[model samples]
Target: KKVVLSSFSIIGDITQNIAKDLVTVTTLVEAGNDAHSYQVTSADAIKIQNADLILCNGLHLEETYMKYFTNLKKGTKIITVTDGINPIGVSEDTSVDSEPNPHAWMSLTNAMIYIENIRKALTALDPSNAKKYELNAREYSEKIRNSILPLKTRIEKVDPEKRWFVTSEGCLVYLAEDFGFKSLYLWPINSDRSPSMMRHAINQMRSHKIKFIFSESTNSDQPAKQVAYETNASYGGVLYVDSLSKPDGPAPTYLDLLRFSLTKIVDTLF
Candidate 1:
């Protein structure tokens, strides 16, 4: 029997790549939707019911919608990809107390953990294809590792004082740490609405003379753009974070997403 797998779009992208044609994959979130406030539709419910296994990022990252999974069939396999990786607590004002940051896949190393977990899940669901799953996962993991090299080299070229990045959200903390850049957010780590916070970020950017502010794929650039315009800073557009772009877009694959973002930052900074 062909296994049916359902996950939110970000996980869906990773699983689809590993499973290839071995399993039927269904994504719950469409492109451009904010996962933080996304609501499940009837169609999503139908897909979950039909799936042989369900994969989620877990750690309260799904906010209000995660509870929906608890109602699924008892025997249906439900796995959280972040199960083994150490997660930092979300610090945004709107973030729930003690919520682990759900953006673990932002780091390629964390993605390796995700790949291993996916391989285990697929092997359990379709034991006959265990070898295929492991092989495919290994190939993709190598590709992800190779893609981070160019970004690391480019980031090293920036003057340390000029390596600061300001963004609309705190999604890129892991990437920043990896690339040796100091990252700041306009909102309180995760808080969505705080004029005072925005004001504080704006002042900080101007005081530090930050050259550009970065935006994420899932967020509106209006606020970040506005901050840039007022502060005379360049707006670096759309860094992929929580979701992957459509298959034909620049960030279709996880590797493409990282390279594109790093290129954008390097180009805008110097």
Candidate 2:
């Protein structure tokens, strides 16, 4: 059987759905870990050397992993699942210069792009299993679309001006763009924020009357909680974005992650 290595849990979960039992899949960044700050270990280097195919949510998401892939074996295939995605730039105040947001998979439609890229890569590497990959991708995408329709309708019912939520990180740009909600955060990509920035965020949310604030499951919720406190908004618990949860956690799978977050938004806000 072929060996597939994914940069993180979410990509690994999606790849498993497409490859099924046709390949052995492993993840470099484990479930519930922050991908942005992950460093590679010697054991991971060994895995990188041996894998038949490597998948990553690129656009600089896996900066450290991208370097490792540079010197892999000649025949080893590395696929950036976000290759064809039209990336959203980081929110204006969050950075010194705009970088394409690395969190594209947060959008269900962008996740579809990731699926197709993975399907094509897997088919290219193992043509014999092409039909399985194609079939699985189709079924999986259909399931995602079916789940999204009702949520989309529900979100539509919310007054556009009131469809605003805040988080600790600006990772939800694509999700907001796709689902028609405006997103705000204390910082972009990382958790560190200044006192004035936090005050600014609170004031902005207060002006908009955003009722809910959440933090990514992989990061500290304290900052988000503080934001909620300062703004009189309710803390809406954690939303999984940077990674998936453990197998027994609220967001064990990729689809589950999206559904859980979206459902929380609808339930809390509407």
Clashing pairs in 2: none
> Candidate 2 lDDT, tens digit per residue, 1-270?
888899999999999999997999889998866887787899889889879899988877887557877678779988899987877776546456577778899887787998999999899989999899999999999988898768767877989778776888887888888887787877778723667667888898889888888887767899988888888988988787887887898889999988888888788777
TM-score of 1: 0.87
Error of 2 at 68 (Å): 2.0
Instruction: Give me the candidate number with maximum lDDT.
Output: 2
Error of 2 at 122 (Å): 0.5
Error of 1 at 192 (Å): 4.3
TM-scores for every candidate against the unseen true structure: 0.87, 0.93
TM for candidate 2 is 0.93
Best by TM-score: 2
Q: What is the C-alpha RMSD of each candidate to the true structure, in Å?
A: 2.9, 1.9
